[PDB]
Write a protein that binds this ligand. Structure first.
Ligand SMILES: C/C=C\C=C\[C@@H]1O[C@](O)([C@H](CC)C(=O)NC/C=C/C=C(\C)[C@@H](OC)[C@@H](C)[C@@H]2O[C@H](/C=C/C=C/C=C(\C)C(=O)c3c(O)cc[nH]c3=O)[C@H](O)[C@@H]2O)[C@H](O)[C@H](O)C1(C)C
Ligand SMILES: Nc1nc2c(ncn2[C@@H]2O[C@H](COP(=O)(O)OP(=O)(O)O)[C@@H](O)[C@H]2O)c(=O)[nH]1
Ligand SMILES: [Mg+2]
Ligand SMILES: [Zn+2]
Lengths: 99, 83, 374, 208
RNA sequence: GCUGAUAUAGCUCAGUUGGUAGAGCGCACCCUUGGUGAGGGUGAGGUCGGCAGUUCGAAUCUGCCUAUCAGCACCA
RNA sequence: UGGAGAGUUUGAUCCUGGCUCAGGGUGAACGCUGGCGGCGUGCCUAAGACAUGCAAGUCGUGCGGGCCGCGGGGUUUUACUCCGUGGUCAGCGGCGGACGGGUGAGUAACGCGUGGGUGACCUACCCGGAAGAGGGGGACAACCCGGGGAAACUCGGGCUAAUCCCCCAUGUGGACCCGCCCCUUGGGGUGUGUCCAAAGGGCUUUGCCCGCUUCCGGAUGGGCCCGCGUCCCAUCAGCUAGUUGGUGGGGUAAUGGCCCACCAAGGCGACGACGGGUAGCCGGUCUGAGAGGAUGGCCGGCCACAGGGGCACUGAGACACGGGCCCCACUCCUACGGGAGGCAGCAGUUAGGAAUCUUCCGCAAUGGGCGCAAGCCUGACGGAGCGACGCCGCUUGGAGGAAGAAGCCCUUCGGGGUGUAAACUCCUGAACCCGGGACGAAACCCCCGACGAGGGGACUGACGGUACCGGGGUAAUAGCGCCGGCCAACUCCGUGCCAGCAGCCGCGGUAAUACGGAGGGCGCGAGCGUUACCCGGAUUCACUGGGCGUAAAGGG
């Protein structure tokens, strides 16, 4: 009746999730990131962006977001962030971003 | 990948394959890249195989996979031989 | 394996010929693994044709008589002699059918000294009245109705555990014995009249009918000669008897023949499938006939050239013009003749083939092709 | 197929004496010698100025019917004789000469055209080595047509091959009479071919 | 393959009430023409779809069968 | 190197002009007749519905067990069954199902065609080069036990190994915020900071072998974009609100209104917008002297669709032919609680129709998938079958053979035609009978040599016991159309504007070359006629190449 391609489906619902999570982590990361980079959390702001960069790239390591997929999200995270650490911030903990 | 197979030209029972380069996924007698030489099975005519050596090599120096019998028609065509 | 023989029932309506048929199978399944109907004793294989046993349907019942080696006159205990019986009985001689085994069914009904043996008197007396073994006939006793419900309880029962169960063998023993198996000359070409026509998923047109000569198998060229257009040559791709594949299916087995790539129109009844070159369409032909006398049930008057009755060849029923050769005029009954027929429909003839000449719900004459005019 | 039938009836009709039967069609009775007129019931009464058409029809037929080539080939072969660089006059005619069987006939071997054809359809003929049975096989320069061996001792091959002693072959063909060979030195010529045919008309018959 | 209905002169189509089968449109030979129309003349025929049985009497009651029209006859 | 004409308006003539014939083309059909082979080709309608079979799998050289048979019994025996080793059944994990194949429904469209741009981009496997591959934790299947259940299956808990998964270093390197430099749409280099690498499998084990990580260069195939070209209706005239642009975001591999907020009001249109019809486009195809006209089916190229409609996951790649999620129409099972199904893949049924194929043989070749290989899967493919559908090749006989049978038909009764035609005599010998009997097939592999070059060896053929060769050898199918003219081909009879013919003009009303048969004759031949449809002739939509004072046409 059936074909061993379902093999290719179950083998999906899996990765189908494996990267879904890695995804929604960067989202809940980024939000919770800029969410503080604009408030004035210089230190404990980059802290997150430096954490993000990490979680984002590793995603790249897989079939999830690839190539520019993250190279993109970065140039906006640290982009957006710093463009907030100017509402009277000064990148205290010069963790990820650079002067 | 990019291989070096053959295309079945010639009537029924009357083959006349054509040695050529083409992105594997193509259809046998399907559009290919550039021609390299021919082959006549029944060996009718002492002119039943040529292969543009010079050209045959370029395609390899850049990564071209021949067939198993394509490998051969080249072996008969002394392509790897370098002395 | 076990020799095969196409059989059936006959008789007057409501007697039970239709249901006796029910009993015959069933039972035969207990002591026989893997079991028109099909059942098989522990000695033979079998084909049965419950006839419609009723006026009107006769026309396809007679074609049912042509298709059998033996008739099973069924009769009721409470009843006995009956009109439809007297009828579906003389037609037993006309259309071959050698030997006849009467089964007094409903046996289990109103007791009586005579009756039981008084009925065998209205039988045996009515049997010789038609020049048959009216004296030495296998008359069995044991209502099949009643036995057909004993096997329904539990689908397994050997050699008669319920009286009537064994009384079903009085037949399953009286028919094996008594009624031998004739020849079906396979050394001849091929041939076999068409009874009906079916259609199927992937297959298509299948032909039902008895094989007369030789044998067929997948990969054989054949001719479909039988009225309309012209003979149609086709290859047989399906040879299955009784719902299951028959390998070479010879003469004496009504299998379904699948004629490659055809339609269900080009293959209607009264046709014939034979060896490419066996039989051809012929509309005019000589033939020595036997006008059936008035005392034999047929014409009680006679006729004159120009008459036009109906001839029944094999499994057909057609109308032709009788052109009596100069001098041949008012040829009365009980008389044999020799004239010609000109069927209004081209038909499959092979010179020296038997046929009859009827008219008006009665048999009028017996003929056999002599030579073919056209 | 290639007609097959009364052919000394066309000796008539076209009224330009023909010899498709060879020996007899060559005697004092080519059928033509007794009836210079078309067959049929009438055949000998006034004639309407044959239409510009007509003419061309007789001219073709005259030729096409002078070989055995059934239209289909002839007109087909005609076409080939067009594209071919050069006058359609010669060429075609030549092209009609290139016929293996004809050639045979052209080179003794057989008494008439209709005969040379059977010779090819039975094996008796053979070219530069291997043998041929296609009346259609077209002959090329320097190719010699040879009789087979199994036949050489045949009653017919005899007499027929005898008619050579003395007579000479067409100026584009040779002949080893004893070794039955003779080559095809070159596509014959308009003048060489003394045929009762006005090619230039047969041509005109196909533009319309 | 089972029934049901329709089968009436060349065509339309009347009817009966079991018994010497109608109407007109047409149509055939006339006189006339070149031929026809028209005009004046003369009429001459129905296998009641077909083969067959019943009656003293068969197109009307019986039986069969043929072209055609309508039907949950109809997968070895 | 290339152009041909006529029949028809008259009492007759010339002019305009419509119609029509002679030509060539066809995936055809219908009629009558039908012997062969090879090469082609074979639903043009219902993108209708499909009882069955087969189309996509392959790795133990990624890993761990189930299991059937063999090595040696842990100890000392059956015990903690440990291990040597090949089949085998799923499961895990990998590359592959996104090509091959099928169809044209849709679509007037940057869809296709074509020439370009990408400083706006991707690409598995494939070769070149640079650097590497050190340590670490764990889950779920398989399996064992318990359950619901008609079933399809599936729920609970418990171990378990990996090239499956996550964390650290490692930073040759690449990705990002920012600053400088040369360059100019995001390309190239440079400094600080941040951020990511990774798997072991095989045997002959400090060395090969297929892999892994990141980087870069090459190749191949792609996405997007642009000028240009792309059918009819104007009795269709105005069309638009995410509509036109901006700004900042989301999303993307990437540009962009693609999407969304904000503003501004634009954008398009007689150079034909908006709407309606039709239709997959080209390479090409038929015709034509050419220019044009008509066309887009065999094969290739691009696109589109996979029962109808929507969608996302997986991945380099699809929003997925034979995978998934849902709605719908419809079919099948049903323990009536919830399952199952898409042949526009191959073979075939049926429905419609004027009409279009075998439930096939083989993987030997070729080609594609997976592997170290062996080799396995392959209805793509290579062959075969049916169909005069087409083309080309072939036969039904060849040479004799009468002032001229017979029969049939005209007949100025003298005699003329069928007719050398037949008969007959030679001869050849399609078939049928006999034996031999193919190439296509040489490599993966093995051996010397490093699995290099090179050299050496072997197995392997579905069509086939067919083709072709040699031997023997029987005279052995013919049919259709037409004969007043256009147009090759004439007479007798029957018929009496009746029966009937007819592409056009027209024939038939008691002599018919025209109706019907006959004799005869002409074209063609397994074909030949008819119908349908494209071009031509038609300078008859005219550029080539026309016309408008009365023929068609000047606008009052
Ligand atoms: C009859 C239908 C189809 C026949 C088909 C073919 O018949 C056959 O051609 C056949 C070949 C011989 C054939 O021609 N049959 C054709 C003919 C065959 C005739 C044969 C034999 C006879 O002999 C003279 C035979 C019956 C004979 O008659 C006697 C009977 C007399 C009866 C009088 C009636 C009586 C009292 C009566 O109450 C009565 C009645 O019966 C009917 C109606 N109303 C009545 O009131 C006696 O019984 C003898 O035995 C082949 O068999 C074919 O193979 C076939 C089967 C295809
Ligand atoms: N008394 C009795 N009646 C039976 C028997 N068999 C059948 N019948 C009844 O007889 C009648 C007709 O039966 P059926 O088989 O149809 O007879 P058919 O007319 O020959 O087909 C029905 O009522 C049956 O049930 C039997 O053995 N005995
Ligand atoms: Mg059944
Ligand atoms: Zn002559």
């Amino acid at each position: 009746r059936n074909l061993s391609a379902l093999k290719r489906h179950r083998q999906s619902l899996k990765r189908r999730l494996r990267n879904k999570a890695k995804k929604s982590a960067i989202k809940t990361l980024s939000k919770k990131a800029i969410q503080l980079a604009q408030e004035g959390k210089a230190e404990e702001a980059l802290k997150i962006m430096r954490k993000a960069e990490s979680l984002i790239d590793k995603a790249a390591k897989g079939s999830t977001l690839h190539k520019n997929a993250a190279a993109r999200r970065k140039s906006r995270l640290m982009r957006k962030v710093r463009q907030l650490l100017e509402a009277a911030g000064a990148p205290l903990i010069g963790g990820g971003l650079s002067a | 990948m990019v291989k070096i197979r053959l295309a079945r030209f010639g009537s029924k029972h009357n083959p006349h394959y054509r040695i050529v380069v083409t992105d594997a996924r193509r259809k046998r007698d399907g559009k290919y890249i550039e021609k390299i030489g021919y082959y006549d099975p029944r060996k009718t005519t002492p002119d039943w195989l040529k292969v543009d050596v010079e050209r045959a090599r370029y395609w390899l120096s850049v990564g071209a996979q021949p067939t198993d019998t394509a490998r051969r028609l080249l072996r008969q065509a002394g392509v790897f031989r370098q002395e | 394996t076990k020799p095969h023989v196409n059989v059936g029932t006959i008789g007057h309506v409501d007697h039970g010929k239709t249901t006796l048929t029910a009993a015959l199978t069933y039972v035969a399944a207990a002591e026989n693994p893997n079991v028109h109907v099909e059942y098989e004793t522990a000695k033979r294989h079998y084909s049965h044709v419950d006839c419609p046993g009723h006026a009107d349907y006769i026309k396809n019942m007679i074609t049912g008589a042509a298709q059998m080696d033996g008739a099973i006159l069924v009769v009721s205990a409470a009843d006995g002699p009956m009109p439809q019986t007297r009828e579906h009985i003389l037609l037993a001689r006309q259309v071959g059918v050698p030997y006849i085994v009467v089964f007094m069914n409903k046996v289990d009904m109103v007791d009586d000294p005579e009756l039981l043996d008084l009925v065998e008197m209205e039988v045996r007396d009515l049997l010789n009245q038609y020049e048959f073994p009216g004296d030495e006939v296998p008359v069995i006793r044991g209502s099949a109705l009643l036995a057909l419900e004993q096997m329904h309880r539990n689908p397994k029962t050997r050699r008669g555990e319920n009286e009537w169960v064994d009384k079903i063998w009085e037949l399953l023993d009286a028919i094996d014995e008594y009624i031998p198996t004739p020849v079906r000359d396979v050394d001849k070409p091929f041939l076999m009249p068409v009874e009906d026509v079916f259609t199927i998923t992937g297959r298509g047109t299948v032909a039902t009918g008895r094989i007369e000569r030789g044998k067929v198998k997948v990969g054989d060229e054949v001719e479909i000669v039988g009225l309309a257009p012209e003979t149609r040559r086709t290859v047989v791709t399906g040879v299955e008897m009784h719902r299951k594949t028959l390998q070479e299916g010879i003469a004496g087995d009504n299998v379904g023949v699948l004629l490659r790539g055809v339609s269900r129109e080009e293959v209607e009844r009264g046709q014939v499938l034979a060896k490419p070159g066996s039989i051809t369409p012929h509309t005019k032909f000589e033939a020595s006939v036997y006008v059936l006398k008035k005392e034999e049930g047929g014409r009680h008057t006679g006729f004159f050239s120009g008459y036009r009755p109906q001839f029944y060849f094999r499994t057909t029923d057609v109308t032709g013009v009788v052109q009596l050769p100069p001098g041949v005029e008012m040829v009365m009954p009980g008389d044999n003749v020799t004239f010609t027929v000109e069927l209004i429909k081209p038909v499959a003839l092979e010179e020296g083939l038997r046929f009859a000449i009827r008219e008006g719900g009665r048999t009028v004459g017996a003929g056999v092709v002599t030579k073919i005019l056209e | 197929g290639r007609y097959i039938g009364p052919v000394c009836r066309l000796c008539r009709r076209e009224g330009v004496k023909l010899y498709l039967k060879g020996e007899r069609c060559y005697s004092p009775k080519c059928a033509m010698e007794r009836r210079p007129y078309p067959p049929g019931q009438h055949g000998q009464k006034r004639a309407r100025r044959p239409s510009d058409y007509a003419v061309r029809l007789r001219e073709k037929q005259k030729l096409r019917r002078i070989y055995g080539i059934s239209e289909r080939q002839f007109r087909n072969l005609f076409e080939e004789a067009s594209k071919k660089k050069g006058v359609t006059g010669s060429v075609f005619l030549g092209l009609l000469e290139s016929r293996l069987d004809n050639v045979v006939y052209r080179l003794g071997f057989a008494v008439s055209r209709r005969q040379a054809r059977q010779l090819v359809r039975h094996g008796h003929i053979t070219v530069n080595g291997r043998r041929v049975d296609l009346p259609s096989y077209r002959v090329r320069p320097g190719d010699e047509i040879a009789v087979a061996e199994k036949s050489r001792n045949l009653e017919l091959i005899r007499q027929n091959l005898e008619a050579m002693k003395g007579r000479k072959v067409g100026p584009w063909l040779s002949l080893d009479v004893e070794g039955m060979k003779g080559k095809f030195l070159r596509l014959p010529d308009r003048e060489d071919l003394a045929l009762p045919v006005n090619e230039q008309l047969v041509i005109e018959f196909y533009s319309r």
